[PDB]
Amino acid sequence: SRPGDEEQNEMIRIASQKRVYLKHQRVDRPARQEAAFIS
């Protein structure tokens, strides 16, 4: 074996995975931002 094998295996493992996209993601309307008041 050679010193650089581990990095090659890691980059092999990273490449194949599920790839979702930012769009097609559900975003709901946020609730009303209640106002805070100092004393």
Partner: protein, 177 residues
């Protein structure tokens, strides 16, 4: 891919070196304080970051004897979705991040009224799958960046039954006139 390294996500603080920035040291400190520490695709507050012309900007090929204007520019990083004219394009948009450079000179040469660019750079846009990729490219090539984050349409409840609703009892009196 759109949704997926710490150093790329880290935003360095500004160090004042120019006399003008030494005068406005309080403002530099305040900007360092208020700006986000790290940048991720889940952020909501956009921000502008200056170019980092340190040893990290050594990988640019755009510093030539005839060109001293490309390095140090500030790009814009944002997602450009399909416009409001059509819903189902054959090539869809919004699946990638766009890095864009503002125009530097545009005119019309008079012999035939022909459109001319005074800057051959910034003619086309650059496309990346992830925001981290665009920021890493900017850090490699000595570019600043204006990062803005996408806005998406909310989810809503849809049904055909909503078209046919009972108006209610005829005795419902509206006291609000």
């Amino acid at each position: 891919m759109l949704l997926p390294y710490f150093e790329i996500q880290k935003i360095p603080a500004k160090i004042a070196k120019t006399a003008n920035e030494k005068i406005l040291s309080v403002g530099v400190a305040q900007k360092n304080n208020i700006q986000p520490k790290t940048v991720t695709a889940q952020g909501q507050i956009g921000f502008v970051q200056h170019p980092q012309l340190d040893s990290s900007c050594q990988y640019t090929q755009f510093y030539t004897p005839q060109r001293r204007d490309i390095r140090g520019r500030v790009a814009r990083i944002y997602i450009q979705d399909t416009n409001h004219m059509h819903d189902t394009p054959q090539i869809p948009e919004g699946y990638k991040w766009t890095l864009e450079f503002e125009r530097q000179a545009q005119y019309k040469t008079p012999w035939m009224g022909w459109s001319f660019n005074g800057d051959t750079f910034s003619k086309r846009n650059h496309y990346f799958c992830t925001l981290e990729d665009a920021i890493s490219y900017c850090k490699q090539m000595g570019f600043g960046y204006e990062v803005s984050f996408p806005r998406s349409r909310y989810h809503t409840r849809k049904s055909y039954a909503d078209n046919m609703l009972w108006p209610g009892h005829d005795n419902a009196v509206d006291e609000d006139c």
